[PDB]
């Protein structure tokens, strides 16, 4: 039993997105498909579900009338239609199933697809420099993923990369620091290598 | 946590049941047992009578211009709880509630029909049509007293069956038809994958054709039919298709032709069919298509109520047809019997 | 009855004593009163015409409603449609035979084909009225029948047996009792058509009485019986019981007047009554038209 | 008996009777001259 | 229906007995399930019906019910048992999940090393000022940073527990405009780490 999911992406408020989860190892009529929210740093939240046997359709209060859930029995897959996406819709959506008749909880979960809604654009990161410690600041980058390495990956121990933090303008910012003895300065050179593939931007500082 | 509970007015005639669905084995039904707490100071001389009844509520979706009682009791039993070994659940309930806990128990005899509800048409009204089992407890000096529902608690129970552990041989059948030249005409071999299928599980049928005749077959018709064998005053066999598939495949005037068809019966596309047999409703809710009635090898007696069976029928419109009989049933829960908290749309 | 040819022949053989209607020639009769039965049965014509027109309109509407709404289709509604079609055909045949006979080789054929059609449609309507009651009785007391062989048998009993004895009557009349226009009565041959209708009426009344008494036994309890019996009365054609087996009487007798003025109107409006009661205001039809103790708990132990 | 067939028969008989009565009345009037 | 898990965050060690608890606003029968979710992974079903262990789950996990209150016991902890556990009630269509409870690796308390980096020259040239306060490794997650300026507009992010020497690392930043940075001359971040006997304040001057 595997629930592979597709359709995740980056959209702006008021747009529409399609989430597709292929169902394998179980029958649509013998199972009930569910979609579960998980906002960044928050708990789970049910949004919609479908029971093809009784062809029921249920939606959350914040989702009732905005999304639509449908199942393709012939293709053995479930689709969730999202409309009028708003800022708070940003969350990781998991597709889960349950036995059609004897619910017995949500047994199988598919790998969630990240759905993010914001009005910001893809802006390249800005890099600024900062036992002793040293680091650099990555700021003003909209895309979530970031790759940071020190001395081309030579320095691994004592290196901390903090989680990204949102900014009032919708951009992200994270800081990377490394702890090194203060007696190594003057002969040892430290270089921060940060790669941002979403914008294809590489900066060395 | 475990046991259900219901009450009725000042009498404190609270009846306790450990389970609502009582599984039936083809020669032994699960005993009904429970506890009916009462207040002797209120009952006084009145005796606490509890009754189990199986009732067939017949056509009263027809005959609405005669709205009265269109029922016959198939079985009844009565036990005077307040003037049999006590089960573990009964012992626990007596220990918890205390002195005023008076137990009751019934043996359901084998070969009675399972809880089956015939589906309503448009403009559905009334409790049900079909077979349902009820436990009620009431206070009266005699069982013949006219009860006015003031101090009576009524609970609907279900008698259910689950798929046998060992499936039988895969249903295989064939039919041969000849016409005109009759040299070596069609023989219609059909074979299911297995005999036992679970609700929502696809039904797979393998069919073979040998059209060695001048006239070909235009369509291959596959459908699952529910054969509700009804019996009350007279006996009848209603055929209501639950899954139907039409294939435009044609067989050339040649020796061989092979293909496999898959079907899946479900209640969404069979709601408008009035009279379709459904699993007994515990209340005003929805339930899946009726499970096959398993029968003992003694006799398929004209047994009262509804007996349900399924066949997939494969038809060749040259017509040549053959039926494969099968069992549509739930697997044994291996857990608590009831629905297991299907979400309620409050 | 003596026709004009009878009097002409009697005169050809020769107040006189040979005239049926027995200054000189003081043989005048009370023809002035006789000249008012025309207005009498013209009033009858008007009442039955209006009643059958209303019934035909209502039955056409009911049949269209039943046929178009496929979710209503079932054996009960199939029998209802058959009964409605029977009523409509009876009314249409009455109108057609009235027009043909009263102008409002071919001589005998033109009138006799219409008369045969009218008789066949009246008989089939009377038999379908009983078929409906027979289906109610089977549902009440012989519940859960195959309903397919039953539907076929009901259709046959409603369409052929009336055709059977109508064919017998028309064959006998043509072979040995042909008398010009077929609107006359030839001896007792009319009883061939009539007796089956009376038998159907009495059987339907017996079924109605049985059902009514069973409903009463099952049961202000008398309040409930009234609605059921009133609703069933139009279905079973109970009004036919009142004047069945009554001998044909003079065309102006008080018994004849009270019989006709009531029976014709009730027969004409029976179709409208049944269409209103059993189609427009009965259960699923209204819904289709418009859409177009304590609680149980769980404890520990 | 059934009202419709009896009414039809009575109408036919009345038509015949009226026609022959009219014929007889016309003959009587002619005879009076 | 609302389901509140009493422990928002819990700390324990391998071999210890942990008992997560939850309570519902009203009776939901035994229709309660518990899920386990590793960070960056989908939730995994542990218990259904509030007492039935899902097939393949370790036998140490156990579920219990007390009226509207439901309890999850992990028994002898294991290295794989450190995750976030969510409850759920499915008696009604509006399924409600709990707030979630995190299980933390518990070890000896370690004091942080406070580091404050003044904004770089390029940062000033860009027209913005961003000074970052760093605490490095320290087990407690309750440490708080207060900024002293000659407040409110601050950001904080804490790294999860380390692999071997599990300790949280917290970083805080103060954002100000070029004019705002220039008009002020002294900056400092004060840490109220629980392990520290007294608060430690580190300051620097713009010059």
Q: In terms of domains, do B100 and B39 share one?
A: yes
Q: Which domain holds residue B65?
A: 4-160
B181, burial (CB in 10 Å: exposed 0-12, middle 13-18, buried 19+):
exposed
Q: How far is CA D5 from CA B152, C37, C88, C192, C268, in A?
A: 62, 17, 18, 12, 14
What's the longest Cα–Cα distance across chain B?
89
Q: What is the CA radius of gyration of chain B?
A: 25
Residue B294 is part of a domain; what is its CATH number? 2.60.40.640
Nearest Cα to Cα of residue E88 among B335, A81, A71, A37: A37
Residue C119 is part of a domain; what is its CATH number? 1.20.1070.10
Least CA distance to B266: which residue of chain A?
A: A53
C-beta separation of A21 from A5 below 8 A: yes
Residue B91 is part of a domain; what is its CATH number? 2.60.40.840
Interface of C with D in 78-97 (CB under 8 A): 94, 97
Q: In terms of domains, do B113 and B37 share one?
A: yes
> What distance lies between CA C276 and its chain's CA centroid?
17
Q: In terms of domains, do B197 and B79 share one?
A: no
Residue A185 sits at φ, ψ, to 5 deg, of -70, 150
- Single residue among B137, B160, B183 that ends a domain in this structure: B160
- CB atoms B345 and E95 under 8 Å: no
End-to-end CA distance of chain E: 58
DSSP labels, E123-179: HHHTTEEEEEEEEEEES-S---EEEEE---SEEEEEE---SSS--EEEEEEEEEEHH
Q: In terms of domains, do B258 and B176 share one?
A: yes
Three-class SS of residue A199?
coil
Query: Which residues have CB under 8 Å from E9's CB, separation 6+?
Result: E101, E102, E104, E141
Contacts A54 to B, Cβ<8 Å: 267-268, 286
Residue B42 to residue B38: CA distance in whole angstroms:
8
Domains of chain E plus CATH, in order, are 3-105 (2.60.40.10), 113-205 (2.60.40.10)
Query: Which residues have CB under 8 Å from B148's CB, separation 6+?
Result: none
The two beta strands, E200-205 and E186-191, are antiparallel
CA angle B87, B93, B94 (to 5 degrees): 90
B41, burial (CB in 10 Å: exposed 0-12, middle 13-18, buried 19+):
exposed
C-beta separation of B237 from B219 below 8 A: no
B262-265 — which CB contacts under 8 Å span 24+ positions? B262/B202, B262/B203, B262/B204, B262/B205, B263/B202, B263/B203, B263/B204, B263/B205, B263/B222, B263/B223, B263/B224, B263/B312, B264/A27, B264/A29, B264/A73, B264/B200, B264/B201, B264/B202, B264/B203, B265/B203, B265/B224, B265/B289, B265/B310, B265/B328
Q: Count contacts between B and C (CB, < 8 Å).
A: 102
- Single residue among B160, B186, B204 that ends a domain in this structure: B160
Q: Is B344 on the interface with E (CB under 8 A)?
A: yes
Name the helix (H) or strand (E) containing B3: strand B3-6
Contacts C246 to D, Cβ<8 Å: 1
Is residue B29 situated within a structural domain? yes
- Please report the resolution in angstroms: 3.1
Three-class SS of residue B305?
strand
B132, burial (CB in 10 Å: exposed 0-12, middle 13-18, buried 19+):
buried
* E-state strands within chain C: 297-299
Q: Which two tokens stand for residue A196?
A: 């941002």
Chain C: closest CA distance from residue B122 (Å)? 6
Domains of chain A plus CATH, in order, are 2-117 (2.60.40.10), 126-204 (2.60.40.10)
Q: Count contacts between B and E (CB, < 8 Å).
A: 26
Interface of E with B in 46-75 (CB under 8 A): 49, 52, 65
- CB atoms B266 and A104 under 8 Å: no
C-beta separation of A107 from A97 below 8 A: yes
- CB atoms C139 and B96 under 8 Å: no
Residue C195 to residue C182: CA distance in whole angstroms:
19
Q: How was this entry determined?
A: cryo-EM
Number of separate helices (H) and strands (E) present in chain E: 2, 18
Do chains E and B touch by CB distance (3+ pairs < 8 Å)? yes
Residue B6 sits at φ, ψ, to 5 deg, of -155, 155
Residue B75 to residue B106: CA distance in whole angstroms:
12
Q: Which domain holds residue C211?
A: 60-279
Q: Which two tokens stand for residue E35?
A: 């899920």
- CB atoms B122 and C72 under 8 Å: yes
Nearest Cα to Cα of residue E181 among E114, E133, E127, E145: E127
- Single residue among B160, B195, B227 that ends a domain in this structure: B160
Chain B: closest CA distance from residue C235 (Å)? 11
Is residue C16 situated within a structural domain? no
Compute the Cα dihedral for B264, B267, B270, B275 and give only its sign. positive
**Best B343, B344, B345, B346 residue to mutate vs chain A (most A CBs within 10 Å):** B343
Chain C: closest CA distance from residue D30 (Å)? 12
Three-class SS of residue A99?
strand
Structural domain count of chain B = 2
Q: Which two tokens stand for residue B132?
A: 């349902």
Q: In terms of domains, do B47 and B119 share one?
A: yes
End-to-end CA distance of chain C: 96
* E-state strands within B107-161: 116-118, 129-140, 153-160
Q: Is E14 on the interface with A (CB under 8 A)?
A: no
List chains adjacent to chain B, taking adjacency as at least 3 C-beta pairs closer than 8 Å: A, C, E
- DSSP lists the bridge partners of residue E132 as E117, E173
Residue B306 to residue E103: CA distance in whole angstroms:
55
- CB atoms C299 and B5 under 8 Å: yes
Q: In terms of domains, do B48 and B117 share one?
A: yes
- DSSP lists the bridge partners of residue C195 as none
Crossing angle between the packed helical segments C75-102 and C106-141, to the nearest 10 degrees: 160
Is residue B267 situated within a structural domain? yes
C-beta separation of B13 from B48 below 8 A: yes
B137, burial (CB in 10 Å: exposed 0-12, middle 13-18, buried 19+):
buried
Residue B339 to residue E72: CA distance in whole angstroms:
24
Query: Which residues have CB under 8 Å from E142's CB, separation 6+?
Result: E194
Is residue C27 situated within a structural domain? no
Q: In terms of domains, do B156 and B264 share one?
A: no
Interface of B with A in 195-214 (CB under 8 A): 198-202
- CB atoms E134 and A133 under 8 Å: yes
Residue ranges of alpha helices (H) inside chain B are: 40-43, 88-97
Structural domain count of chain C = 1
Residue B64 to residue C285: CA distance in whole angstroms:
13
C-beta separation of D13 from C43 below 8 A: no
List chains adjacent to chain C, taking adjacency as at least 3 C-beta pairs closer than 8 Å: B, D
Residue A3 to residue C82: CA distance in whole angstroms:
56
Q: CB A33: neighbour CB atoms within 10 A?
A: 27
When CB atoms are compared, the residue of C139, C231, C296 closest to B4 is C296
CA angle B260, B261, B262 (to 5 degrees): 125
Is residue C107 situated within a structural domain? yes
- CB atoms A55 and B202 under 8 Å: no
List chains adjacent to chain D, taking adjacency as at least 3 C-beta pairs closer than 8 Å: C
Q: How far is CA E117 from CA A140, E21, E133, E155, in A?
A: 19, 43, 7, 15
Nearest Cα to Cα of residue A44 among E79, E90, E23: E90
Binding site: what residues of B are annotated? 239, 244, 313, 315
C-beta separation of E46 from E54 below 8 A: yes
When CB atoms are compared, the residue of E31, E65, E93 closest to B345 is E93
């Amino acid at each position: 039993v595997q629930l592979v999911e597709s359709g995740g992406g980056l959209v702006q408020p008021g747009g529409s997105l399609r989430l597709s989860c292929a169902a394998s190892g179980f029958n649509v009529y013998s199972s009930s498909i569910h979609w579960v929210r998980q906002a960044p740093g928050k708990g789970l939240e049910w949004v919609a579900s479908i029971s093809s046997y009784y062809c029921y359709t249920y939606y959350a209060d914040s989702v009732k009338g905005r999304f639509t859930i449908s199942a393709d029995t012939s293709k053995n897959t479930a689709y969730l239609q999202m409309n009028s996406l708003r800022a708070e819709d940003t969350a990781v959506y998991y597709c889960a199933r349950s036995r059609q008749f004897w619910y017995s909880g949500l047994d199988y979960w598919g790998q969630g697809t990240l759905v993010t809604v914001s009005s910001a654009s893809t802006k390249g990161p800005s890099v600024f420099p900062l036992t002793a410690a040293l680091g650099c600041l990555v700021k003003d980058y909209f895309p979530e993923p970031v790759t940071v390495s020190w001395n081309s990956g030579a320095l691994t121990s004592g290196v901390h990369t903090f989680p990204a933090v949102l900014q009032s303008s919708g951009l992200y910012s994270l800081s990377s620091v490394v702890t090194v003895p203060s007696s190594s300065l003057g002969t040892q050179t430290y270089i921060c290598n940060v790669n941002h593939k979403p914008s294809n931007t590489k900066v060395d500082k | 946590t475990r046991v259900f509970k219901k009450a009725s007015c000042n009498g404190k005639l609270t009846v306790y049941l450990g389970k609502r669905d009582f599984v039936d084995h083809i020669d032994l039904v699960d005993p009904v047992d429970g506890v009916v707490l009462v207040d002797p100071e209120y009952l006084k001389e009145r005796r606490v009578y509890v009754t189990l009844t199986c009732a067939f509520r017949y056509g009263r979706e027809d005959l609405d211009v005669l709205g009265l009682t269109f029922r016959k009791d198939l079985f009844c039993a009565n036990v005077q709880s307040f003037p049999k070994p006590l089960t573990r659940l009964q012992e626990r309930l007596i220990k918890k509630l205390g002195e005023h806990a008076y137990p009751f128990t019934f043996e359901i005899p084998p070969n009675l029909p399972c809880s089956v509800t015939l589906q309503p048409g448009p403009e559905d009204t009334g409790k049900a049509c079909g077979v349902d089992y009820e436990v009620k407890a009431f206070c009266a000096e005699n069982l013949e007293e006219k009860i006015h529902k003031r101090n009576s608690v009524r609970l609907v129970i279900r008698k259910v069956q689950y798929a046998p552990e060992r499936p039988g041989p895969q249903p295989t059948a064939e039919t041969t038809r000849q016409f005109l030249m009759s040299d070596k005409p069609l023989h219609l071999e059909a074979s299911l994958d297995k005999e036992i299928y679970y609700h929502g599980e696809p039904i797979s049928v393998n069919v073979h054709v040998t059209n060695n005749t001048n006239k070909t077959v235009k369509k291959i018709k596959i459908s699952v039919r529910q054969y509700a064998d009804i019996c009350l005053f007279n006996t009848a066999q209603y055929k209501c298709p639950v899954a139907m598939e039409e294939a435009d495949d044609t067989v050339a005037p040649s020796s061989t032709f092979c293909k496999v068809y898959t079907l899946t019966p479900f209640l969404c596309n069979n709601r408008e069919k009035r009279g379709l047999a459904l699993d007994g409703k515990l209340k005003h809710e929805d339930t899946n298509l009726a499970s096959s009635t398993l029968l003992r090898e003694g006799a398929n007696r004209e047994i009262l109520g509804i007996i349900v069976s399924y066949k997939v029928k494969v038809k060749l419109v040259v017509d040549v047809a053959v039926e494969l009989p099968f069992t549509l049933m739930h697997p044994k829960p291996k857990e608590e019997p009831p629905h297991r908290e299907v979400p309620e749309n409050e | 009855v003596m026709t004009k040819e009878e009097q002409i022949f009697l005169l050809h053989r020769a107040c006189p004593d040979y005239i049926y209607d027995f200054n000189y020639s003081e043989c005048v009769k009370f023809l002035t009163n006789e000249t008012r039965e025309r207005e009498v049965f013209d009033r009858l014509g008007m009442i039955y015409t209006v009643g059958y027109s209303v019934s035909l309109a209502s039955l056409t509407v009911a049949v269209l409603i039943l046929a178009y709404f496929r979710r209503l289709h079932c054996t009960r509604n199939y029998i209802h449609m058959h009964l409605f079609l029977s009523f409509m055909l009876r009314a249409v045949s009455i109108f057609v035979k009235d027009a043909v006979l009263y102008s409002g080789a071919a001589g005998y054929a033109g009138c006799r084909v219409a008369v045969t059609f009218f008789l066949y449609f009246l008989a089939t309507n009377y038999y379908w009225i009983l078929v409906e009651g027979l289906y109610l009785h089977s549902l009440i007391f012989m519940a859960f029948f195959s309903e397919k062989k039953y539907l076929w048998g009901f259709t046959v009993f409603g369409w052929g047996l009336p055709a059977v004895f109508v064919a017998v009557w028309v064959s006998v009349r043509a072979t040995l009792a042909n008398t010009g226009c077929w609107d006359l009565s030839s001896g007792n041959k009319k009883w061939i058509i009539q007796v089956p209708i009376l038998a159907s009426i009495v059987l339907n009344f017996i079924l109605f009485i049985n059902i009514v008494r069973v409903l009463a036994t099952k049961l202000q309890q008398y309040r409930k019986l009234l609605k059921s019996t009133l609703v069933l009365m139009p279905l079973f054609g109970v009004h036919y019981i009142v004047f069945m087996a009554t001998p044909y009487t003079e065309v102006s007798g008080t018994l004849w007047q009270v019989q006709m003025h009531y029976e014709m109107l009730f027969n004409s409006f029976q179709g409208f009554f049944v269409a209103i009661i059993y189609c427009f205001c009965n259960g699923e039809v209204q819904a289709e038209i418009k859409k177009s103790v304590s609680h149980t708990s769980v404890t520990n132990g | 008996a059934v009202a419709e067939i009896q009414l039809m028969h009575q109408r036919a008989k009345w038509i015949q009777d009226a026609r022959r009565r009219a014929f007889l009345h016309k003959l009587i009037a002619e005879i009076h001259t | 229906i609302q389901m509140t898990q009493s422990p928002s965050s819990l700390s324990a060690s391998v071999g210890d007995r942990v008992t997560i608890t939850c309570r519902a606003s009203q009776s939901v029968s035994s229709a309660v399930a518990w899920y386990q979710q590793k960070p960056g992974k989908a939730p995994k079903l542990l218990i259904y019906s509030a007492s039935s262990l899902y097939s393949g789950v370790p036998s140490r996990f156990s579920g219990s019910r007390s009226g509207t209150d439901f309890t999850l016991t992990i028994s002898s902890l294991q290295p794989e048992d450190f995750a976030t556990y969510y409850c759920q009630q499915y008696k009604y269509v509006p399924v409600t999940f709990g707030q979630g409870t995190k299980v933390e690796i518990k070890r000896t308390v370690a004091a942080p090393s406070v580091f404050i980096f003044p904004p770089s020259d390029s940062q000033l040239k860009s027209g913005t000022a961003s000074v970052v306060c760093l605490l490095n490794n320290f087990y407690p997650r309750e440490a708080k940073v207060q900024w002293k300026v000659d407040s409110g507009n601050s950001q904080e992010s804490v790294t999860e527990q380390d692999s071997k020497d599990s300790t949280y690392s917290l970083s805080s930043t103060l954002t100000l405009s070029k004019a705002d940075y220039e008009k002020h001359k002294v900056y400092a971040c004060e840490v109220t780490h629980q392990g520290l006997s007294s608060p430690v304040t580190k300051s620097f001057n713009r010059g």
